Amino acid sequence: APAILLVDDEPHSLAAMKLALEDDFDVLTAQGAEAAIAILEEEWVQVIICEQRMPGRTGVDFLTEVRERWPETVRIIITGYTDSASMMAAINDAGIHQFLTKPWHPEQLLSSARNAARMFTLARENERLSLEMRL
Amino acid sequence: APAILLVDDEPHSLAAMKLALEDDFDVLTAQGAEAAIAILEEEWVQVIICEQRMPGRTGVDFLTEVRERWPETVRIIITGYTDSASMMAAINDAGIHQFLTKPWHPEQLLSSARNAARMFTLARENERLSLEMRL
């Protein structure tokens, strides 16, 4: 069973988001891009939820690399940040699958996560069928 | 190109949600279960966003019928209603793809919708490959 990885500058938020998710996933938890890549090199993640507004490397810059390296992973930005249009285009340039806002509701967060997981499953099995039919 | 159907008791909310969505979909708009089924019998909808808390027939009761009749359609409940557990189990009994809360943010709503559309596309093409490989 693959994990969900939560990536956020602010550890209180990581531990809150995990409360909403632990009952339904293996939750993995990272405190910035660097830590999160370290985890991605190390194990199997179906879904990532990542704060945009982090020190140093942004959510999208992080997730653009992820889209490059683990293309199968479903990517989600979440931010409480009252919106710049620039952030949106940046999010839109990268293929980000969901944008969520803060504060989040546990049932909405959970539902987004489950929905990202089902999408991971579909894409992955969609690809299995392409490869297999070719043969 | 298939539509998004918004279903809500309260027409102000329908016309607001369409503002967030019109630039990216053909938005269709219904003011209760009955009106919404009438539209579903009549045309092609990839995604439905539907208030739960409607007079007479509920969001889930509506969407359970929809799951029966147009199984390909991606189904979304949205409600400002501060939560009963009963509502959640009911939502969970039916295969509802997203639960959203009110008030909604235009970029989060739009993102949910786009994401439901991509999922409609995947499921639909996932099925096209099953059928075709069988042959």
Side-chain angles (χ1 to χ4, degrees):
Chain A
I4 179 149
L5 172 67
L6 309 179
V7 181
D8 197 326
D9 185 22
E10 218 266 284
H12 292 192
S13 145
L14 282 178
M17 297 196 281
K18 167 169 166 172
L19 290 187
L21 297 164
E22 67 202 350
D23 291 349
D24 294 72
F25 299 82
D26 304 321
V27 178
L28 303 174
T29 209
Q31 200 186 324
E34 162 149 47
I37 277 131
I39 294 181
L40 289 172
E41 280 155 354
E42 181 58 27
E43 36 214 305
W44 190 34
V45 179
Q46 50 176 156
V47 181
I48 291 145
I49 324 258
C50 175
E51 166 67 59
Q52 161 56 358
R53 225 61 203 344
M54 296 186 295
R57 223 188 154 176
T58 68
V60 320
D61 183 289
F62 168 55
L63 287 161
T64 35
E65 166 176 346
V66 189
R67 155 203 224 189
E68 285 168 29
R69 300 229 255 143
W70 307 269
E72 311 213 309
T73 294
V74 178
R75 306 143 229 149
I76 302 174
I77 297 271
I78 189 158
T79 188
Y81 192 61
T82 300
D83 303 20
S84 72
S86 346
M87 189 202 283
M88 296 316 150
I91 295 166
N92 286 330
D93 280 337
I96 272 128
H97 315 89
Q98 319 206 30
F99 165 74
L100 295 175
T101 58
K102 279 170 176 179
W104 44 265
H105 180 111
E107 290 286 358
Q108 178 162 26
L109 183 67
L110 175 57
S111 179
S112 241
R114 287 172 166 149
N115 177 262
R118 283 184 322 251
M119 151 154 304
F120 165 84
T121 277
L122 265 201
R124 231 199 137 202
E125 213 257 348
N126 210 264
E127 191 223 355
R128 200 191 130 271
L129 305 177
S130 308
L131 303 197
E132 281 197 294
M133 140 148 189
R134 260 190 214 135
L135 311 165
Chain B
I4 179 149
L5 172 67
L6 309 179
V7 181
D8 197 326
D9 185 22
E10 218 266 284
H12 292 192
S13 145
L14 282 178
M17 297 196 281
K18 167 169 166 172
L19 290 187
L21 297 164
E22 67 202 350
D23 291 349
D24 294 72
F25 299 82
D26 304 321
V27 178
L28 303 174
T29 209
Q31 200 186 324
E34 162 149 47
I37 277 131
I39 294 181
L40 289 172
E41 280 155 354
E42 181 58 27
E43 36 214 305
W44 190 34
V45 179
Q46 50 176 156
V47 181
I48 291 145
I49 324 258
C50 175
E51 166 67 59
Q52 161 56 358
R53 225 61 203 344
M54 296 186 295
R57 223 188 154 176
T58 68
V60 320
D61 183 289
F62 168 55
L63 287 161
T64 35
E65 166 176 346
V66 189
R67 155 203 224 189
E68 285 168 29
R69 300 229 255 143
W70 307 269
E72 311 213 309
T73 294
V74 178
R75 306 143 229 149
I76 302 174
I77 297 271
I78 189 158
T79 188
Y81 192 61
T82 300
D83 303 21
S84 72
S86 346
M87 189 202 283
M88 296 316 150
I91 295 166
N92 286 330
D93 280 337
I96 272 128
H97 315 89
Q98 319 206 30
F99 165 74
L100 295 175
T101 57
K102 279 170 176 179
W104 44 265
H105 180 111
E107 290 286 358
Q108 178 162 26
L109 183 67
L110 175 57
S111 179
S112 241
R114 287 172 166 149
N115 177 262
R118 283 184 322 251
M119 151 154 304
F120 165 84
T121 277
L122 265 201
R124 231 199 137 202
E125 213 257 348
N126 210 264
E127 191 223 355
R128 200 191 130 271
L129 305 177
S130 308
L131 303 197
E132 281 197 294
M133 140 148 189
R134 260 190 214 135
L135 311 165

